[PDB]
Amino acid sequence: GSGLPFLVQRTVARQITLLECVGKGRYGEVWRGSWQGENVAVKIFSSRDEKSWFRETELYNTVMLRHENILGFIASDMTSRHSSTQLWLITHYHEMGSLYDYLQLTTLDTVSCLRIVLSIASGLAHLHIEIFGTQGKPAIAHRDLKSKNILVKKNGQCCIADLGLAVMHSQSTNQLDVGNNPRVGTKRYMAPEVLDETIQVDCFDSYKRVDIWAFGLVLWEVARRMVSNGIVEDYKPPFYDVVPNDPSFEDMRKVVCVDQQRPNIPNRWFSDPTLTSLAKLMKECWYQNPSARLTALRIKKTLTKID
Ligand SMILES: CNC(=O)[C@H]1C[C@H](n2c(-c3cc(OC)c(OC)c(OC)c3)nc3ccc(C(=O)NCCCN(C)C)cc32)C1
Numbered sequence: 001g002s003g004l005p006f007l008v009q010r011t012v013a014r015q016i017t018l019l020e021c022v023g024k025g026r027y028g029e030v031w032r033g034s035w036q037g038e039n040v041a042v043k044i045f046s047s048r049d050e051k052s053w054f055r056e057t058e059l060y061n062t063v064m065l066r067h068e069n070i071l072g073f074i075a076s077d078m079t080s081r082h083s084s085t086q087l088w089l090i091t092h093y094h095e096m097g098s099l100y101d102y103l104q105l106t107t108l109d110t111v112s113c114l115r116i117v118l119s120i121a122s123g124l125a126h127l128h129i130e131i132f133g134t135q136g137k138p139a140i141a142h143r144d145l146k147s148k149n150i151l152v153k154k155n156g157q158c159c160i161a162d163l164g165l166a167v168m169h170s171q172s173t174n175q176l177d178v179g180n181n182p183r184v185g186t187k188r189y190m191a192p193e194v195l196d197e198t199i200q201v202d203c204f205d206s207y208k209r210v211d212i213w214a215f216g217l218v219l220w221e222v223a224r225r226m227v228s229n230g231i232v233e234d235y236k237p238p239f240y241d242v243v244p245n246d247p248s249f250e251d252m253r254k255v256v257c258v259d260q261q262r263p264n265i266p267n268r269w270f271s272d273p274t275l276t277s278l279a280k281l282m283k284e285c286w287y288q289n290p291s292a293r294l295t296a297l298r299i300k301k302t303l304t305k306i307d
Contacts, residue, residue: 009075039093052164069123096152125296141207169204209290216285
């Protein structure tokens with residue numbers, strides 16, 4: 001799999017001491033833990049999200065996902081702490097936390113902006129691409145790509161996190177996991193075909209194109225925080241101005257499906273070559289027609305050529 005030898009994995013949870021709680025939400029809790037005096041991140045899942053714990057555990061153990069831009073899996077366990085049975089996912093610890101939180105604390109220059117977005121595109125392309133052979137991997141669509149599910153490294157690269165909603169496709173196999181409704185992710189980031197439920201649930205490539213829509217929104221979030229001529233925008237989530245907090249499906253449908261609105265491009269971006277290029281790139285992620293959207297590899301290539 002992606003983590004420790006497995007026999008090691010079961011013993012890891014018992015060797016971990018939880019030191020600080022660094023995150024808490026409806027998903028559960030995230031802690032900085034220590035394993036042999038080395039930091040690890042321990043996500044303790046709420047009962048609401050227990051199935052996400054199981055699906056992510058299945059995945060990381062059935063596919064050996066190892067990539068610098070994917071959160072590094074260490075182990076998963078159903079363990080007991082303080083006499084309560086708990087669902088733990090243990091990964092590499094990234095002190096900087098989520099991109100969402102990071103963008104609200106500092107601003108970016110051209111180098112650090114491009115490093116962030118390129119690393120996300122590289123991670124997403126690695127998820128998306130199916131690799132044949134005994135040491136390959138199925139294609140993976142994330143289905144909840146957003147800034148809260150991206151972690152920042154000290155070196156300024158990022159890695160994609162939270163595969164609990166991901167769907168896998170082997171070009172050999174048939175059927176896509178999917179199941180239930182297609183509207184499983186974060187409403188604010190949902191593509192038009194999800195919101196209006198016209199997505200072809202049987203076509204795996206539909207899910208990759210949904211990730212690309214969300215990636216375009218993440219690019220917009222990040223680009224706002226890149227300084228140009230001492231100018232920068234405050235952090236805002238996508239569509240902050242046109243929809244309420246915790247927006248409903250109907251809110252999103254009118255903006256994105258009926259009006260076909262997209263996040264607004266700050267005028268000052270067209271005073272800077274990099275931001276001008278990023279604006280064009282994100283618009284090619286937001287086509288109403290999913291098949292017109294760029295692929296993750298095309299985005300990666302374009303970003304590598306920008307400087
Ligand atoms: C998920 N929601 C949240 O709000 C946050 C993000 C999540 N976090 C993870 C993490 C872990 C996962 O598995 C273990 C996981 O699932 C695979 C996952 O999914 C997205 C994320 N490592 C983290 C390491 C540090 C921090 C942190 O905040 N501060 C430290 C100082 C930085 N400060 C100024 C912003 C948060 C971490 C808690």
